Design a protein around this nucleic acid. Sequence first.
RNA 1: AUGUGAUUUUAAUAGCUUCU
RNA 2: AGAAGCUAUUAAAAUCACC
Lengths: 512, 131
Amino acid sequence: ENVTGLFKDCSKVITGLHPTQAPTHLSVDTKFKTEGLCVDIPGIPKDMTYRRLISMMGFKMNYQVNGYPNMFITREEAIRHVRAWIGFDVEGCHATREAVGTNLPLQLGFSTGVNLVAVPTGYVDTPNNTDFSRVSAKPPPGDQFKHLIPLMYKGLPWNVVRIKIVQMLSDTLKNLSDRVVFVLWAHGFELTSMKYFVKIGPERTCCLCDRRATCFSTASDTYACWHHSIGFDYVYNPFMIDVQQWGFTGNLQSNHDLYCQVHGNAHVASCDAIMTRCLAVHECFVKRVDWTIEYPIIGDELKINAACRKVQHMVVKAALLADKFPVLHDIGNPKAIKCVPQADVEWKFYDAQPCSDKAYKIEELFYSYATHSDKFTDGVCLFWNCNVDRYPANSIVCRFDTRVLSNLNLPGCDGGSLYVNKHAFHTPAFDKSAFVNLKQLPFFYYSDSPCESYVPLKSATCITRCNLGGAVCRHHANEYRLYLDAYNMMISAGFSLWVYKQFDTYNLWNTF
Amino acid sequence: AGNATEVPANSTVLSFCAFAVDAAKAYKDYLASGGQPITNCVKMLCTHTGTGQAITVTPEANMDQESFGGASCCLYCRCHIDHPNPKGFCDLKGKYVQIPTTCANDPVGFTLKNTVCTVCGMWKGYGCSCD
RNA sequence: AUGUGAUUUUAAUAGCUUCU
RNA sequence: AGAAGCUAUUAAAAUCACC
Ligand SMILES: [Ca+2]
Ligand SMILES: [Ca+2]
Ligand SMILES: [Zn+2]
Ligand SMILES: [Zn+2]
Ligand SMILES: [Zn+2]
Ligand SMILES: [Zn+2]
Ligand SMILES: [Zn+2]
């Protein structure tokens, strides 16, 4: 055989091409082809007016060059860039008049939620150049595709839908990352649709800047980072990844709909690229959090984690010292790191799975409500960052509220979201039905540190012996304001604390 | 539908050169680092006895040269991107190209690096006698 | 007046080899 | 002249994905 679908001439002219103005030997007509070496017949002249729609279908980016990065990546280098995933699915239209045989791209769709229709435009090989221009097309046949019937009567030329892909990518990935990982399901028509807006080249650096160069400008032959790309039309080096080569057998809607019941309305581009990114977040993160892959520091990563550690250190000691629990359980704590070491409770580590150490004899147990509703009755069970469907009636829960969108909280599978902060936590959907045995937590600060000797602050929330009197000391006012800052920055970050029913803030007062 | 043009040996060089901001530099870098030249060029069965010229309407091949079809040596014509020539017209497409036979296993890499002497129409340095 | 492919089959058409 | 096996050229069908 030894043929490829690439650059396949899709005209319906019966004749071939002249010896010149023919790209390869296989495209010359039979009148000239003799023993693999074409002959110049002076009688037959060459065509001077003709148009042939070249088919840009079947690109194979398996090149290995020294300076040039590879497009396709291995799934140990795509999990390290998870802030830069943008799903991609393209719906096509077939060329019907004066050209047959190629699927021109009609509708581009991203995980951002933006459908960009384009006019059908193909590479027409004129006598003097390759005239990138509009070809005639028909939308696909059948009642499966009927919402592409109006789209061919609208759209934009490919010099405005090349700048509304670099005005959308640049506004999505401005703060997440400095590259783009195009998660594609097909690995075919998408590459065909990336001839139009992608130019790979040597590894470059932004003009008058320092970030990686990810946007090309054809008018002024320069490069840009994601912040300075206003008016720049060609996407510089992307990375892509094919989800069907991860061992999937079947349609897309018969492999997404086994994990997620929130997305739908398939064979629309934004709902093929959302299922394509949903399934690819599932196949990498929903199994278990991977503690080996660190992540860069986008912003507020140091303060949020230390504030969470501060409030988790605070609330547990308060509930333990207030209610005098004999034993305290723990669930989902991967290592054994005692949050409050100066305590009397016995820290039974009912971990999910043993993680890289047995020095502290961490127990192995998975939690589900209908399974373990009557297993733990003694004490209180610290479900810090646990993912169980429903929590028991005695617990101190901190669950990430997955309806808040930020540069940390990437969207994820089954309405739950991917909270990528120095690690990747795939928290499931935040439903109210999980908290039917719990209540919210009031805001308060409690410390046993003796008072040492500025604006006077009067708040009944703070629990110290100085604020119980008339004068509030300066050895507790800065403590209360720092704790309030940590608490409000955490709640703004998206966590949500929950506590058992019998939590009484007045039980803490009689301890003094 | 359609009449196939390429072979799977050239696809890995065509794809990588289809996406490039500069088509000439990328082929040279492919050639340096473990790269097989572009096969399937169009070759002319000339009488192979003729006066030498770089680009002609009829194949004029000297005994130390091979005349190829000028559409399979221009890399820009060959990847279907826009020529960098002013007026956006390929110079080589339509006319019969000539490549010295010592380097005519890879025509496209000859027409990217070399140039044509303006006063005598020969390949400069390859038989151009302009001392 | 036939959308891209890939993998199977099933027919024919070319060779290459063996046997009758 | 046929059979058997192998590799290829074309055509039809089946299954699968993309549309
Ligand atoms: Ca697709
Ligand atoms: Ca699709
Ligand atoms: Zn910049
Ligand atoms: Zn989904
Ligand atoms: Zn004090
Ligand atoms: Zn050219
Ligand atoms: Zn000269």
